[PDB]
Write a protein that binds this ligand. Structure first.
Ligand code: CLA
Ligand code: CLA
Ligand code: CLA
Ligand code: CLA
Ligand code: CLA
Ligand code: CLA
Ligand code: CLA
Ligand code: CLA
Ligand SMILES: CCCCCCCCCCCCCCCCCC(=O)OC[C@H](CO[C@@H]1O[C@H](CO)[C@H](O)[C@H](O)[C@H]1O)OC(=O)CCCCCCCCCCCCCCCCC
Ligand SMILES: CC1=C[C@H](O)CC(C)(C)[C@H]1/C=C/C(C)=C/C=C/C(C)=C/C=C/C=C(C)/C=C/C=C(C)/C=C/C1=C(C)C[C@H](O)CC1(C)C
Ligand SMILES: [Ca+2]
Lengths: 42, 221, 743, 81, 159
C-alpha cells in the first residue's frame, strides 16, 4: 500500500499516467471545440 | 501384507502406516522427497479417502433411482438415468422446484460452508471448535487426523472404540472407496459409449451376454 | 537416477518491497543512481538472469516463470483478436460472400477526423481492412456465428489468467529445483508425444467432426445461419452419414483394420479445392492424423524411468570417427548446464522453421479463400520471413554469449567445439572467398546488364533473349515434381502444388488462385543474389561466434566480456572488436537479405501468378510478365518495381489508405533518423551535453541525476534498432497500400 | 471376424513379439542394448512378478511394437493382395 | 587413429596437416609443378607456365567477347589475350623490379620438409625472377598464338 503508492510514483508510471490524463484532456477539448485554427472569443 | 506391482523407490515411502497400503505407486507420486503444493503424501492420502467417500455416495446414488424405477410406487418421471437428471442438459433435463442454476448456487453455498470449514480444520487442526456457530462447535473439534475427525456428529454410533477396530474398519472403508471410484468411472464411460444407464444396461447384460463391450464397439452416439 | 517431481516451497515471498527499489537484482543499481547512464543500464540487464547471479537453479526458476508470463501475454493477444472479430468485425457478412467483402476487424473512433480510416470494406460495415488472415482461420475451423467467437475470447481470457497465476505460483510458492530442469529425457518424451502428438491428434479430431462437415455445408452454398450447430454433428450422427456415408460404420473400420472404408474423408488428393482455392480439408485431416501417429511414436525414444528408451548421453558419445577424434563426447554435459546453448540451437531451428512455413504457405494455401486474398497472402509471407530472419540472427547472438560466458574447457570439454576453434581461420577465410566470388558473379551480372543496356547493346546482356542463364536444375526438379503424381507418387491425383506445373490453373471469383510458375534467367540471377546475401550474413555471424573469445588482434577478448565498446584505439584501432558488435552487423545484412527476398517474392507474384482470369481463360496478370525482361537490370528494379509500385502509396492520401501513406513517410523519417546514431560517436555528444548542462546550471535548473550521453554500445543499439524499424515499416506500408489498392 | 481374416496376422505378430520380449531374443526392461548385437543384464528398480524379470513396462512396450508391425504387415498385404 | 596432425609434428606453427594440405598424391602433384621445381633453371619453368597460361587466356576471351558473333571473333579475342598476357608480364616485371635486388641472395627457404639443407631456390632472386618472367612472356605469346593457330586458321572439329 505504502510501497504500492511508491511504485505508482516511479518515473515511467508517473509519466504515463500524467500523459494519459493530458491526452484525455486535449482529446475532450478538441471534441467540444473542433477544427480550431484561431482564438475567436476575444 | 501382499504387494502389487511395487517399486524399490515406491516401497521406501509406502511401508504400511496408511490403510490400503499395497505399495502400488508405479508413477511414484507420494514421494516424500518432492513434497510441495498438493503433492505432499498426507494430502494425497486425505484426497484418496475423500474421493472414495464422495464416490461411494455418488455410486449408490446414481444407480438408485433407476433401480426402484422398476420396483415400487416410485413414478417414472422420478425414474431417470443418472445422466438425464439435468446434470448434462443436452442429454436430458427436468423441472424441479428451482431453475437448475439457482439449484446449483444453493447447492454450492451449502457445500461452500461445509467444505471451507473442513479445510479450515485440515490446515490448522482443531480450529473449528473455537469460534461460535449457533452452538455446534463443540462437535466440530476433530481428532488430529483430518480424514477421521470423529466426534458427536461424524461418529454418533461410536464404532471402533479400540483401535484395531479402527484399523480394519479403515481398511474396509478405503477398499470400498476404491471399488466405488472405479465403479463411477465405469458408469461414466459406459453411459457415454453405450448411452443406456448402468442399472438397465446391467439388466440387458444379464439377459444373455450377446451384448459384449465389443458389441457396442460401434459407438452408437 | 529415477525421475520425479522435485520442488521447493515459498522460495521468494510475494511483496511490494522490491518494486519500490529500481534495479534490486543489480547490487550497484539497487543503491541508486548518480547519472543518466544508470537508468539505461537498469533496462539493458533486466532479463539477463545469468549475470544477476551464478546459481543455475535460480536462473532456471526465473526462466520457467518468465516463460509463463510470456504465454499469458500471448493468450491475452489471442483473446483480443477473437474479441475484435466477435464485436468490431464484419465476419458474418464476409462469411455470406467471401470474394466480394473485404475482411476488417477494427474500427476507429471519430475524434479528429480520423474516421476517414473507416473505409468501405463492404457488408454494411466501415472499418480498417485487416490482413491477419484471421477470417480464413475462423472459416476453416467452422466458426459461423459471433457467439462462438465471444466464447473463444472469454476462454482465452481465462487461460491468460491461468497462465499468469501459474507463473506466480511456480516462482513464489512451488518452484522446481535443478534436477527437475536438468531432466531432458522425460521433457523430450513429453513434448514430442504429449504436446505435439496429442496436440495434433486432438486437432485432427476437431477437423473430423467440426470443420469437415461445416465446411462441406458452407461449400454446398447453405446460408451460414441455416447450418446445423457443430454439436449437432456429434449428437445426431446421420447428419454426418449424409455428407460422409462411411461415418455409418462408426469406428468399427478403425479396428477391423478396414481403413479403406474411411477413404471418404481421409484422402490423399493433393492440389487445391477448385471451389475455395485452398487445400482439401479431407487431406488436412488425414495429414494431422498421420502427424499425430508419427509424433506419438517418436516421443517414446528416450529412457525416463522404466529401462526402455535411449540415454541421450549414450547416443551422443557413440558417434565419433577418425576425422573428429572423440566428437560428441561431452556435449550432453554442455547442453544441460548452459541455457544459452539451448537458446541458440532453438532459435536457429525456429527461424529456419518460420521461413519454411512462409514458403510452404505461399505455395500450398491451406485456408479457404486465402489464395485469392492477395493482401493476406503477401502480408503473411512477408511477416513470417521477417520473423524467421530475426530469430536466426538471435541464434548467433546467443551462440556468441555462450562462447564468451559459459564455454570452459577445464570442466566441460568437448572435442568438436575445440577443433572448430582451432581452425576457425581456415573456416573464415574460405567463407570470405565464397562471399566475394558469389558477390562478383551475381551482382556483377546485374551491373553488366545495366551497362550493356545503357550502351544500347541488349544482345550482349545476360537475359532470356541475348545470353541465357537458365536454372536447368530448378527447372528439372520442378518438372520432376509435375510428373510425380501417378508415376512416383501413385496415390496422389494432383501434384502437391500448382507451381510445379501440369497446367491446371485454378481461379476463384474471377481471380487467379494458382498456376505454374516459370523459372527463367531472371530467376537464376535473383536466386544467386539470395545465396550471396545469405552467405555474407552467415560469414558475419560465424566470424563473430568463432572469434568471440580471442583473436590475433586482442589475445584476451573474453576478459573484456561478451559486450563492450572497444579496448582503446591501439594496434591501429579496435572499434567494435566484440562478439555483440558482430550481431549488430548481421542484423544489417539480415535486413538486406530479407528485403531482397520479399521484393523478389512480391514482384514475381504480381508479374507471373496473380491477376484476373476472364471468360475465355485469358489471364491478365497485375504486371504483364514485366519480371522476365525488366528484373535483369537494376534500372528495372528502380523503375518497374519501386517507382511503378510506389505510386499506389503516394496517392493513398485523401482516402481510407491514407494511414499507409502517413506510415510510409514516417518510416522514411525514422530510418533517416537512425543515421544520426549510426554515423557519430558519443564524444561529441558528451561535449555538447556539457554546455547544455551549463545552460541549466546557470538557472538553478540542473538535474541531480547527471545527464550523460549514451554508452558507445547503446548508441550503436539505438542506431540499429531505429534503422530496422524505419526500413521494415516503410516496406510494410508500401506492400500493404499497394496490394490493398491493386488487389 | 475372429481367427479367420486379419485377426490371425495381428495375433501371430503381437504374440511372437512379446514371446520374444519375455525371453531374450529382444531388448528388455532388464536387458540393455549394446549395438544391436549383445544385451547386458540390468535392474530397472521397478518390481516384477514374472520369474524371467518381465515387468509391465516390458509387456506394454513389446505389445505396442508388435501391434505396429502387425498393422504394417496387414495394411501392406491388403494393399497389394 | 587420427588424420589431421600438426605440421611436421610441430603444434605451434600456424598451420595443420590434412588430406587436401598433405595427402601423397596431392603432394607429388604440387611438387611436380614448374613453380615448385626448385632445382630447375627459372627460364624453362617460366616457358612451361607462360605457354599454359597463354593458351588458356584465348578460350574465354574469344567466346565471351563482344565480337563473338562477328567473323573476326577468333582474331579479336586472340588479340585481347595477347593484350592481357602482355599486361600480366608488365605486372610480373615491375613486381620483380620492386621486390628484388641483384646483390641480394634468395629469399626462398633453405630447409626442406625433413630438416636437411638445400640450395635456396634461385627463382626468388633478382635475375632468377627476370629470367622467369622473360620465359613467361615468351611462353604466353607463344601459347596464345598456338591456341589462336589451332582454331580459325585450321578448321580442326571442336565443341
Ligand atoms: C451426493 C449424491 C447424490 C446426488 C448429487 C444426487 C442427485 C440427485 N438425485 Mg439422488 N440419491 C442419492 C444420492 C445423490 N443424489 C442416494 C445415496 C440415494 C439413495 C440410494 C438417492 C436416491 C434418489 C432417488 C430415488 C431420486 C434421486 C433423485 C436425484 C435428482 C434430484 C434429487 C432432488 O430432487 O434433490 C432433492 C430434493 C428434495 C426435496 C430433498 C438429483 C440429480 C430423483 C430423480 O430425479 O430421479 C432420477 C429421484 O427420484 N435420488
Ligand atoms: C492486443 C489486444 C487488443 C488490442 C490491440 C485492442 C485494441 C482496441 N480495442 Mg479492444 N479488446 C480487447 C483487446 C484488444 N483491443 C479484449 C481482450 C477485449 C475484451 C474481450 C476488448 C474489448 C474492447 C471493446 C469493448 C472495445 C475495444 C476497443 C478497441 C479500440 C480502441 C482502443 C481503446 O481501448 O480505447 C481507448 C483506451 C482507453 C480508454 C484506455 C483503456 C483502459 C481500460 C479501462 C482497460 C485498460 C486498463 C488496464 C487493464 C490497466 C482499439 C483499436 C473499442 C473500439 O473498438 O471502438 C470501436 C471498444 O469499444 N476493445
Ligand atoms: C491529434 C491527432 C490524433 C489524436 C488526438 C488521436 C486520438 C485517438 N486515436 Mg488516432 N490517428 C491519428 C491521429 C490522432 N489520433 C492519425 C494521424 C492517424 C493515421 C495514422 C490515426 C489513426 C488511428 C487509428 C487506426 C486508430 C486511432 C485511434 C485513436 C483513439 C484511441 C487510440 C487508442 O485508444 O490507442 C490504443 C488503446 C488500447 C490498445 C487500449 C489498451 C489499454 C492498455 C494499453 C492496456 C494495457 C494493460 C494490459 C492488461 C497489460 C498486459 C499485462 C498482462 C500480463 C496482464 C484516440 C481518441 C484508435 C481508435 O479510434 O479506436 C477505435 C484507432 O483504431 N487513430
Ligand atoms: C503432455 C504434457 C505436456 C504438455 C501438453 C506440455 C505443454 C507445454 N509445455 Mg511442458 N513439460 C512437460 C510436459 C508437457 N508440456 C514435462 C513432462 C516437462 C518436464 C518435467 C515439461 C517442461 C516444460 C518446460 C521447462 C517448459 C515447458 C513449456 C510448455 C509450453 C510450450 C510452449 C507452447 O508450445 O505453447 C503451446 C500452448 C498451449 C498448448 C496452450 C495450452 C496450454 C495447456 C493448458 C498446458 C497444459 C499442460 C500441462 C503440462 C498441464 C499439467 C499441469 C497441471 C498440474 C495443471 C506448452 C504449453 C514451456 C513453458 O513453460 O511455457 C510457459 C517451457 O518453458 N514444458
Ligand atoms: C481426439 C479426436 C476425436 C474425438 C474426441 C472423437 C470423438 C467422437 N467420435 Mg470420432 N474420429 C476421430 C477422432 C475423434 N473422435 C478421427 C480422427 C476419426 C477418423 C478415423 C474419427 C471417426 C469417427 C467415426 C466414424 C465416428 C466417430 C464418432 C465419435 C463420437 C462417438 C462417441 C463415442 O462413442 O466415442 C465421439 C464424440 C462416432 C460419431 O460420429 O458419433 C455420433 C462415429 O461414428 N469418430
Ligand atoms: C526466444 C527469443 C529470445 C530470448 C528469450 C532472448 C533473450 C535474451 N536476449 Mg536476445 N535476441 C533474440 C531473441 C531472444 N532473446 C533475437 C531474435 C535477436 C536478434 C535481434 C536477439 C538479439 C539479442 C542481442 C543483441 C542481445 C540479446 C540479449 C538477451 C538477453 C537480455 C535481453 C534484455 O533483457 O534486453 C532488454 C530488452 C529490451 C531493451 C527491449 C528493447 C525494445 C526493442 C529493441 C524495440 C522493439 C520495437 C517494437 C517491436 C515496435 C516499436 C514500439 C515503439 C514504436 C513503441 C536475454 C536473456 C542481450 C544480452 O546481453 O544477452 C545476455 C543482448 O545484447 N538478444
Ligand atoms: C525418390 C523419389 C520418390 C519420392 C519422393 C516418392 C514419394 C512418395 N511415394 Mg513413391 N516411388 C518412387 C519414388 C519416389 N516416391 C519410385 C521410383 C517408384 C517406383 C516406380 C515409386 C513407387 C511408389 C508406389 C507404388 C507408391 C509410392 C508412394 C509414395 C508416397 C508415399 C510415401 C511412402 O510410401 O512412405 C514411405 C514408406 C516407407 C516404407 C518408409 C521408408 C522410407 C524410404 C524407403 C526411405 C510418397 C509421397 C505411395 C503412394 O501412392 O502415395 C500415396 C505408393 O503407393 N511410390
Ligand atoms: C513384409 C510385407 C510388406 C509388404 C509386401 C509391404 C508393402 C508396401 N508397403 Mg509396407 N510395411 C511393412 C511391411 C510390408 N509392406 C511393415 C512390417 C511395416 C512396419 C515397419 C510397414 C510400414 C509401411 C509404411 C509406413 C508404408 C508402407 C507402404 C507400402 C507400400 C508402398 C511402399 C513402396 O514400396 O513405395 C516406395 C516408397 C518410397 C520410394 C519412399 C520415398 C519417400 C521417402 C520418405 C523420401 C526419403 C526421405 C527420407 C526422410 C530421408 C507397399 C505396397 C507405404 C504405403 O502406405 O503405401 C501406400 C507406406 O507409407 N509400409
Ligand atoms: C494491491 C494492494 C497491496 C496492499 C499491500 O501490499 O499492503 C499490505 C501488505 C503490506 O503491508 C505490510 O503487511 C505486513 C504483513 O503482511 C506487515 O503487517 C507490515 O507492517 C505492513 O506494512 O502487503 C500485502 O499483504 C499484500 C500482498 C500482495 C497482495 C497482492
Ligand atoms: C493408483 C495410481 C497411481 C499410479 O502410479 C498411476 C495410476 C495407475 C494412473 C493411478 C491411478 C489409477 C486410477 C484408475 C485412478 C482412478 C481414480 C478414480 C476413477 C477416481 C474417481 C473418482 C470418482 C468420483 C469422485 C465420482 C463421484 C461421483 C458422484 C459424486 C456422482 C454424482 C452424481 C450422482 C450421484 C447422480 C446424479 O444424477 C449425477 C451426479 C451429480 C454426477
Ligand atoms: Ca512427490
Amino acid at each position: 500500500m505504502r510501497d504500492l503508492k511508491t511504485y505508482l510514483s516511479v518515473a515511467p508510471v508517473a509519466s504515463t499516467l500524467w500523459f494519459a490524463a493530458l491526452a484525455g484532456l486535449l482529446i475532450e477539448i478538441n471534441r467540444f471545440f473542433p477544427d480550431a485554427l484561431t482564438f475567436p472569443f476575444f | 501384507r501382499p504387494l502389487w506391482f511395487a517399486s524399490k523407490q515406491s516401497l521406501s515411502y509406502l511401508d504400511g502406516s496408511l490403510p490400503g497400503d499395497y505399495g502400488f505407486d508405479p508413477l511414484g507420486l507420494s514421494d516424500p522427497e518432492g513434497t510441495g503444493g498438493f503433492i505432499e503424501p498426507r494430502w494425497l492420502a486425505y484426497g484418496e479417502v475423500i474421493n472414495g467417500r464422495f464416490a461411494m455416495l455418488g455410486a449408490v446414488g446414481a444407480i438408485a433411482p433407476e433401480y426402484l424405477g422398476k420396483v415400487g410406487l416410485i413414478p417414472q418421471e422420478t425414474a431417470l438415468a443418472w445422466f438425464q437428471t439435468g446434470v448434462i442438459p443436452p442429454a436430458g433435463t427436468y423441472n424441479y422446484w428451482a431453475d437448475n442454476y439457482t439449484l446449483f448456487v444453493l447447492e454450492m453455498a451449502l457445500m461452500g460452508f461445509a467444505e471451507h470449514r473442513r479445510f479450515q480444520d485440515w490446515a490448522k487442526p482443531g480450529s473449528m471448535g473455537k469460534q461460535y456457530f449457533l452452538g455446534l462447535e463443540k462437535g466440530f473439534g476433530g481428532s488430529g487426523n483430518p480424514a477421521y475427525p470423529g466426534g458427536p456428529f461424524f461418529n454418533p454410533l461410536g464404532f471402533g472404540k479400540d483401535e484395531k477396530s479402527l484399523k480394519e474398519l479403515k481398511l474396509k472403508e478405503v477398499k470400498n472407496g476404491r471399488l466405488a471410484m472405479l465403479a463411477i468411472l465405469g458408469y461414466f464411460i459406459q453411459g457415454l459409449v453405450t448411452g443406456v444407464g448402468p442399472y438397465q444396461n446391467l439388466l440387458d447384460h444379464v439377459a444373455d451376454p450377446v451384448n459384449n463391450n465389443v458389441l457396442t464397439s460401434l459407438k452408437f452416439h | 537416477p529415477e525421475v520425479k517431481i522435485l520442488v521447493d516451497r515459498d522460495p521468494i515471498k510475494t511483496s511490494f518491497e522490491q518494486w519500490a527499489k529500481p534495479g534490486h537484482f543489480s547490487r550497484t543499481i539497487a543503491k541508486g543512481p548518480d547519472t543518466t547512464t544508470w537508468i539505461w543500464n537498469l533496462h539493458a540487464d533486466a532479463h539477463d538472469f545469468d549475470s544477476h547471479t551464478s546459481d543455475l537453479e535460480e536462473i532456471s526458476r526465473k526462466v520457467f516463470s518468465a516463460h509463463f508470463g510470456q504465454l499469458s501475454i500471448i493468450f491475452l493477444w489471442l483473446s483480443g483478436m477473437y474479441f475484435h472479430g466477435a464485436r468490431f468485425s464484419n465476419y458474418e457478412a464476409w462469411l455470406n460472400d467471401p470474394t466480394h467483402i473485404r475482411p476488417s476487424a477494427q474500427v476507429v473512433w471519430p475524434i479528429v477526423g480520423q474516421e476517414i480510416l473507416n473505409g468501405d470494406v463492404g457488408g454494411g460495415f466501415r472499418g480498417i481492412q485487416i490482413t491477419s488472415g484471421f477470417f480464413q482461420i475462423w472459416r476453416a475451423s467452422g466458426i459461423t456465428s459471433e457467439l462462438q467467437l465471444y466464447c473463444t475470447a472469454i476462454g482465452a481470457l481465462v487461460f491468460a489468467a491461468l497462465m499468469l497465476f501459474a507463473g506466480w505460483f511456480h516462482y513464489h510458492k512451488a518452484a522446481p529445483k535443478l534436477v527437475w530442469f536438468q531432466d531432458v529425457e522425460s521433457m523430450l518424451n513429453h513434448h514430442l508425444a504429449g504436446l505435439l502428438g496429442l496436440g495434433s491428434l486432438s486437432w485432427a479430431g476437431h477437423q473430423v467432426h467440426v470443420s469437415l462437415p461445416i465446411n462441406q455445408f458452407l461449400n454446398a452454398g447453405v446460408d451460414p445461419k441455416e447450418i446445423p450447430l457443430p454439436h449437432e454433428f456429434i449428437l445426431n450422427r446421420d447428419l454426418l452419414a449424409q455428407l460422409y456415408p462411411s461415418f455409418a460404420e462408426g469406428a468399427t473400420p478403425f479396428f477391423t483394420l478396414n481403413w479403406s472404408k474411411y477413404a471418404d474423408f481421409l484422402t490423399f488428393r493433393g492440389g487445391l479445392d477448385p471451389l475455395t482455392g485452398g487445400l482439401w480439408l479431407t487431406d488436412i485431416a488425414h495429414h494431422h492424423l498421420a502427424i499425430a501417429i508419427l509424433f506419438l511414436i517418436a516421443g517414446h525414444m528416450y529412457r525416463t524411468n522404466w529401462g526402455i528408451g535411449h540415454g541421450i548421453k549414450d547416443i551422443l558419445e557413440a558417434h565419433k570417427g577418425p576425422f573428429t577424434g572423440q566428437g560428441h563426447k561431452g556435449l550432453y554435459e554442455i547442453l544441460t548446464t548452459s541455457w544459452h546453448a539451448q537458446l541458440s540451437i532453438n532459435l536457429a531451428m525456429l527461424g529456419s522453421l518460420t521461413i519454411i512455413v512462409a514458403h510452404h504457405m505461399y505455395a500450398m494455401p491451406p485456408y479457404p479463400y486465402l489464395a485469392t486474398d492477395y493482401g493476406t497472402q503477401l502480408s503473411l509471407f512477408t511477416h513470417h520471413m521477417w520473423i524467421g530472419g530475426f530469430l536466426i540472427v538471435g541464434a548467433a547472438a546467443h551462440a556468441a554469449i555462450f562462447m564468451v560466458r559459459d564455454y570452459d574447457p577445464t570442466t566441460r570439454y568437448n572435442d568438436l567445439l575445440d577443433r572448430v576453434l582451432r581452425h576457425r581461420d581456415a573456416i573464415i577465410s574460405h567463407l570470405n572467398w565464397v562471399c566475394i566470388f558469389l558477390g562478383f558473379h551475381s551482382f556483377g551480372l546485374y551491373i553488366h546488364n545495366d551497362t550493356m543496356s545503357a550502351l544500347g547493346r541488349p544482345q550482349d546482356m545476360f537475359s532470356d533473349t541475348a545470353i541465357q542463364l537458365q536454372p536447368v536444375f530448378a527447372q528439372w526438379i520442378q518438372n520432376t515434381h509435375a510428373l510425380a503424381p501417378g508415376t512416383t507418387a501413385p496415390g496422389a491425383t494432383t501434384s502437391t502444388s500448382l507451381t510445379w506445373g501440369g497446367g491446371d490453373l485454378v481461379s476463384v471469383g474471377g481471380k487467379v488462385a494458382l498456376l505454374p510458375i516459370p523459372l527463367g534467367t531472371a530467376d537464376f540471377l535473383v536466386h544467386h543474389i539470395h545465396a550471396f546475401t545469405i552467405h555474407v550474413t552467415v560469414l558475419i555471424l560465424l566470424k563473430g561466434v568463432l572469434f568471440a573469445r580471442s583473436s590475433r588482434l586482442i589475445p584476451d577478448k573474453a576478459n573484456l566480456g561478451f559486450r563492450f565498446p572497444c579496448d582503446g584505439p591501439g594496434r591501429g584501432g579496435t572499434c567494435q572488436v566484440s562478439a555483440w558488435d558482430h550481431v549488430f552487423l548481421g542484423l544489417f545484412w539480415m535486413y538486406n537479405a530479407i528485403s531482397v527476398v520479399i521484393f523478389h517474392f512480391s514482384w514475381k507474384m504480381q508479374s507471373d501468378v496473380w491477376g484476373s482470369i476472364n471468360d475465355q481463360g485469358v489471364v491478365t496478370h497485375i504486371t504483364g510478365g514485366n519480371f522476365a525482361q525488366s528484373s535483369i537490370t537494376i534500372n528495372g528494379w528502380l523503375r518497374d518495381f519501386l517507382w511503378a509500385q510506389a505510386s499506389q502509396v503516394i496517392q493513398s492520401y485523401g482516402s481510407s489508405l491514407s494511414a499507409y501513406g502517413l506510415f510510409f513517410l514516417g518510416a522514411h523519417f525514422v530510418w533517416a533518423f537512425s543515421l544520426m546514431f549510426l554515423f557519430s560517436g558519443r564524444g561529441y555528444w558528451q561535449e555538447l551535453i556539457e554546455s547544455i548542462v551549463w545552460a541549466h546550471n546557470k538557472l538553478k535548473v540542473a538535474p541531480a541525476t547527471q545527464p550523460r550521453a549514451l554508452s558507445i554500445v547503446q548508441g550503436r543499439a539505438v542506431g540499429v534498432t531505429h534503422y530496422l524499424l524505419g526500413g521494415i515499416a516503410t516496406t510494410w506500408a508500401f506492400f500493404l497500400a499497394r496490394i490493398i489498392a491493386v488487389g | 471376424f475372429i481367427g479367420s481374416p486379419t485377426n490371425l496376422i495381428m495375433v501371430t505378430s503381437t504374440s511372437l513379439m512379446l514371446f520374444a520380449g519375455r525371453f531374450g531374443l529382444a531388448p528388455s526392461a532388464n536387458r540393455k542394448a549394446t549395438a544391436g548385437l549383445k544385451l547386458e543384464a540390468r535392474d530397472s528398480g521397478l518390481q516384477t512378478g514374472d520369474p524371467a524379470g518381465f515387468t509391465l513396462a516390458d509387456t506394454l512396450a513389446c505389445g505396442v511394437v508388435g501391434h505396429i508391425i502387425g498393422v504394417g504387415v496387414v495394411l501392406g498385404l491388403k494393399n497389394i493382395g | 587413429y587420427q588424420v589431421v596432425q600438426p605440421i611436421n609434428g610441430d603444434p605451434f606453427i600456424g598451420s595443420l596437416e590434412t588430406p587436401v594440405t598433405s595427402s601423397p598424391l596431392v603432394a607429388w602433384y604440387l611438387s611436380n609443378l614448374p613453380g615448385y621445381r626448385t632445382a630447375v633453371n627459372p627460364l624453362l619453368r617460366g616457358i612451361e607456365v607462360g605457354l599454359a597460361h597463354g593458351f588458356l587466356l584465348v578460350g574465354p576471351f574469344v567466346k565471351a567477347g563482344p565480337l563473338r558473333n562477328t567473323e573476326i571473333a577468333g582474331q579479336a579475342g586472340s588479340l585481347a589475350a595477347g593484350g592481357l598476357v602482355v599486361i600480366l608480364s608488365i605486372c610480373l616485371t615491375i613486381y620483380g623490379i620492386s621486390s628484388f635486388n641483384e646483390g641480394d641472395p634468395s629469399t626462398a627457404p633453405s630447409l626442406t620438409l625433413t630438416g636437411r639443407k638445400k640450395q635456396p631456390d634461385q627463382l626468388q632472386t633478382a635475375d632468377g625472377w627476370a629470367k622467369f618472367t622473360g620465359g613467361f612472356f615468351f611462353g604466353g605469346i607463344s601459347g596464345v598464338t598456338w591456341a589462336f593457330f589451332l582454331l580459325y586458321v585450321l578448321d580442326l572439329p571442336y565443341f
